[PDB]
């Protein structure tokens, strides 16, 4: 698991469950290729998106469907979605945790990059 | 101003000056059309991007070139840019402030929406 | 102003109005001495807390009464208050802006420090 | 483990290791009693601070010595420390995760409160 996504809800102080996540990779065409997707589970995590073989250097985009999450709760949100765009670079083994902290009119995203 | 962007630097405790910002509007073809651009000035703000007449209902993207900002300081940051995507003016004209707080591996963005 | 406090609400996308703020300075006895207080006004700001002459070197505490803010809105929040503690003016006089972004279970605080 | 503390470094995109944490409980005297302490480990977590028997309803303070952490890295920080003050309330089983995201001039803190 070189790539993990974790989503938290700052209004309720809870993991954000059932949030759709889409991952894209920038293709030679300079367009965004579907790469992986999933919905967050009870602890607000999405595991198993990819494997070390497939997760080669490149530019990746992580799209989190925050608007549907707030709409389920009855809260009118500002953003259409939250996007995280980054380069993956070989340099030691790397694991990536992309964390997102959600409010209706604000979000924070942080990357924790560790080397096992 | 109907649209104002404010950018702060969490490492130095200072406004983020000379940050490039590009604004796009989603067209009828579902492509992103260039709408306005500029660079933050010394208080970390960008004003004058649009007028009330031009700033019609639509889906807008604000792209903040964070990577160039950190590289000019000697830091290799995680994100390629910070992107904020939102529906604007769909219940009438509003005034939008988009704020971004920058760190090398993390950013936060908040919207303040007022009714003129 | 040598000291300004700005408070935003991440749930509503709005400045946080009528929030009580108390400022304390650490005394020679290591107790917290009351220094200034006030309430945020409609743009979410509190000005006029002190003067350059009064705002000497020291350790200062800014206490933001977040709990009362959320309770007046019907929400039972996690934190009792938000506290910001910092050394001020130790290399000469500076101008401080203390910003706080509020959600029910999360808050962020940032300092912007400028040299007059 | 009803209480866990997790500390992240937004400059380096890493867990914040060896950060001192002190936990206090508000005593009948209305003063702060030492309750638990520790230093964060490699994944930036502090476990084992207390037990369900001892963690009764009350007001608790968590103090994170952020200033020493930045000083070790050669970065001049703004805050003396980060403080988190909250009430623990019986109402179902509750576990508390206090998360802190650190930058030199900014920090965020979030509570994730779950019921097993």
Residue numbers in the entry:
A (entry chain B), B (entry chain A), C (entry chain A), D (entry chain B): 10 to 125
Sentences reproduced from the published study:
In this paper, native MS, neutron crystallography, and computer simulations have been used to investigate the effects of the T119M and S52P mutations on TTR stability and the molecular determinants of amyloid formation.
On the other hand, individuals carrying the S52P mutation develop aggressive and early-onset fatal amyloidosis. The lack of a main-chain amide-H and a side-chain hydroxyl group in the proline residue prevents the formation of two hydrogen bonds and causes a loss of stability of the protein. However, the β-turn between the C and D strands is loosened in S52P-TTR, suggesting that this location is crucial to the reduced stability of this mutant. However, a large and statistically significant ΔΔGmono ( + 2.1 kcal mol−1) indicated that the introduction of the S52P mutation had a destabilising effect on the monomer with respect to the WT-TTR, corresponding to a shift towards unfolded TTR by a factor of ~34. In contrast, the free energy calculations described here provide evidence that the tertiary structure of S52P-TTR is thermodynamically less stable than that of the WT. This, together with structural (neutron diffraction) and dynamical (simulation) evidence of a loose CD loop, suggests that unfolding events at the CD strands are likely.
